[model samples]
Target: VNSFSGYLKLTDNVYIKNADIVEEAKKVKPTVVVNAANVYLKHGGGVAGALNKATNNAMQVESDDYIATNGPLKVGGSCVLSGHNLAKHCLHVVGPNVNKGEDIQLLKSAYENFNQHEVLLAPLLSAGIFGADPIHSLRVCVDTVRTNVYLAVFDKNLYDKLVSSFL
Candidate 1:
């Protein structure tokens, strides 16, 4: 499932309708895939923002540069890494941060069956928040996810490797 909440911007970054992301891949049909990259994941505190609020663009948000906000969903309909009452989308994945999550990976595993597309979004650990230096953990997480998406999209085979890798 694709996320098209309100990030729809100018002609350059037009908002991709939830339906369109799924429709555009019709050419590939059964093999088609639609995935929305993480709404928050980048260098400058993830997604860029204004200098301030009052005088700045109202859309501007505060980022810790190291910590990720969880709620209010970042124009992607889902927050950074929290909650379970999702309005839409079957699967959701959170990238690695300096401080590890107690059950983020577990959450992904639980919703594995609902996933349909092979999403290769940003890597959180790549953001350089933690001083841990264990970048391999992030790579393995994304690679496993990509493989998971592919397996689901093509209906090939299940890769329980994700289980042994994370949880």
Candidate 2:
């Protein structure tokens, strides 16, 4: 279902409130699909869970190793790897656990850090499981990514919220 099927002209290609981000990624054929990951790389729920499942838990193992050697992934920090079950590559970022504003900014920073020609598919970073306001999180993502951002919304209530937010 195309929950919220509309695009805002903030950028050349920034589509928001899409029905399926995974399908969007497939359609765009992005070089890298970004996932909102926690510091520990645990794929508990939200987009991280979907990404982990799609990639056959490769990201979990890779992220776990990276964290084990380096440290817990900090907000605005990211890691990239070849996509296993989906896109050509995968970009994983740690979302903020507290400080709502900072989290949104950091989430934007994570998007900014990535390069061009990459279809960055991501869900609400700190909005859902972390309890940040979903509308604010959606705006942050759209505002930050600006160009080449494909937002995936799987919930009907979320789609309605985002639709109402833009209006």
Q: Which one is best on TM-score?
A: 2
Mind giving the per-residue lDDT tens digits that candidate 1 earns over 1-167?
44323222212211212122222232223332222223342213321211112113322323233135453223212222211121122222333233443333432332232233443212222122322232343333344343322221111121123222332
Model 1, which residues run further than 4 Å from truth? 1-93, 99-116, 119-121, 124-127, 130-134, 147-167
The positional error of residue 113 in candidate 2, measured at the CA in angstroms, is: 2.6
43-137, model 2: which lDDT tens digit per residue? 77777786677667786787778778888767777777666666787777776765444545666666564545345666666766666777777
Clashing pairs in 1: none
lDDT of 2: 0.66
Clashes of each: 0, 0
- lDDT value for model 1: 0.27
Candidate 1 displacement at residue 128 in angstroms: 1.1
Cα-based RMSD of the predictions, in order?
A: 14.0, 4.2
